[PDB]
Amino acid sequence: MENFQKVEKIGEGTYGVVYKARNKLTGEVVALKKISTAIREISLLKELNHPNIVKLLDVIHTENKLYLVFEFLHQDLKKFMDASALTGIPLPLIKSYLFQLLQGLAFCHSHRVLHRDLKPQNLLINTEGAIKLADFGLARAEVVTLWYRAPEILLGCKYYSTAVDIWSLGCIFAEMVTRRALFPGDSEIDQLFRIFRTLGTPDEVVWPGVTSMPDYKPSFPKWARQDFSKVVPPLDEDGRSLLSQMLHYDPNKRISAKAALAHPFFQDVTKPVPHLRL
Ligand SMILES: O=C(Cc1ccc(-c2cccs2)cc1)Nc1cc(C2CC2)n[nH]1
């Protein structure tokens, strides 16, 4: 750590404090996260390189403290969505961001690496129009938000799949479009019942095996499903169809990142420049 000069505190992650810092040897500006199976799994993430994944530059284990050195980006999507609240993020920019994030997920999922905790706070943007996934793989190795958590996790599936990240990304896509969180639960049951009130209480018809899940209760109220036309206006039919597939209850039915990239919604995808004031 004597090789890094702290500039300022930029966040409070799940595991510890995040600083903006300067590398004295290279002149590099980085993000520094202060945190044996953990060392080995984190060392594997150093190799998981993609343009839509925030680069893990180094892992430093000293005085039984763990420091992760990451590429620095100047803003996150939560701040950008707050800044764009009055006007809304333009649809071509939403589409570009969703397309890039799906590329990032398709890459990590092809290497059997899950994120598990996608949220606007860990989606980072730059002036060029890029968006990148941060904290990839750290879940495997302040109240933690439940808003983007997949229903199978809430229902007690301990051996969940890459589909959990598609669910979280569908929640974020809906929030960019409507300028409001899709399912802002403030407890596990509030989170689950918000999902059920919008998508309908799941049953064996739409999700075979759901009633045998560890935290499933036959006493759950039975709510009818709502039309996406009511849930995400003014999203067009291509976007609503894609979102529905990203929010299928059965993780096996839920669209993969690779199949989502082929969706007709991306026929006219472009890479616009965002409006950023730093
Ligand atoms: O999290 C951000 C965005 C951000 C940037 C600056 C600031 C502040 C500036 C002044 C006060 S707070 C607050 C947030 N970036 C970032 C994080 C990471 C790695 C995952 C750690 N890499 N890059």
Is the bond preceding residue 234 a cis peptide, omega within 30 degrees?
Answer: yes
Residues in contact with 117: Cβ distance below 8 Å, sequence separation at least 6, in sequence order: 14, 135, 138, 139, 144, 148, 168
Numbered ranges of CATH 3.30.200.20 in the chain:
1-74
Sequence letter at residue 74: H
Distance CA 272, CA 129 (A): 6
- Contact predicate 182/174, CB 8 Å: yes
Report residue 66: phi and psi, to 5°. -115, 130
Which DSSP letter does residue 75 get? E
- Contact predicate 169/260, CB 8 Å: no
Sign of CA dihedral 2, 33, 93, 253: positive
Q: How many residues does the chain have?
A: 278
3-state secondary structure of 258: helix
Distance CA 184, CA 13 (A): 20
Distance CA 243, CA 100 (A): 16
Numbered ranges of CATH 1.10.510.10 in the chain:
75-276
d(CA 89, ligand 1 centre) in Å:
20
Spacing of C-alpha 73 from chain mean position: 16
- Contact predicate 125/76, CB 8 Å: yes
Ligand 1 atom having least distance to the Cα of 75: 3
Q: Which two tokens stand for residue 73?
A: 């980006």
Report the top-level CATH class of 1-74: alpha beta
d(CA 79, ligand 1 centre) in Å:
10
Q: Which two tokens stand for residue 72?
A: 């620095």
Report the top-level CATH class of 75-276: mainly alpha
- Which residues are catalytically annotated? 117
Question: Which residue lies with its CA nearest to atom 8 of ligand 1?
Answer: 10
Spacing of C-alpha 16 from chain mean position: 19
Q: Which two tokens stand for residue 206?
A: 């739409």
Resolution value (Å, 1 decimal): 1.5
Which DSSP letter does residue 266 get? G
What dihedral do alpha carbons 116, 121, 126, 127 form, nearest 10°?
140
- Contact predicate 180/171, CB 8 Å: no
3-state secondary structure of 145: coil
Q: Which two tokens stand for residue 267?
A: 């026929």
Question: Which residue lies with its CA nearest to atom 15 of ligand 1?
Answer: 73
Mutual orientation of helices 237-246 and 163-178 as an angle, nearest 10°?
140
Distance CA 171, CA 218 (A): 26
Experimental method: X-ray
d(CA 73, ligand 1 centre) in Å:
6
Strand order in the sheet with 56-62: 4-12, 17-23, 29-34, 65-71, 56-62
Decide whether any atom of ligand 1 lies within 6 Å of the 54 Cβ.
yes
Residues in contact with 73: Cβ distance below 8 Å, sequence separation at least 6, in sequence order: 31, 54, 124, 125, 126, 132
3-state secondary structure of 159: coil
Of 35, 57, 76, 135, the residue with max ligand 1 atoms within 8 A of its CB, to mutate for a pocket test, comes to 76
Ligand 1 atom having least distance to the Cα of 10: 12
Binding site as annotated, residues for Mg(2+) = 122, 135
Distance CA 99, CA 119 (A): 16
CB neighbourhood size of 104 (10 A): 25
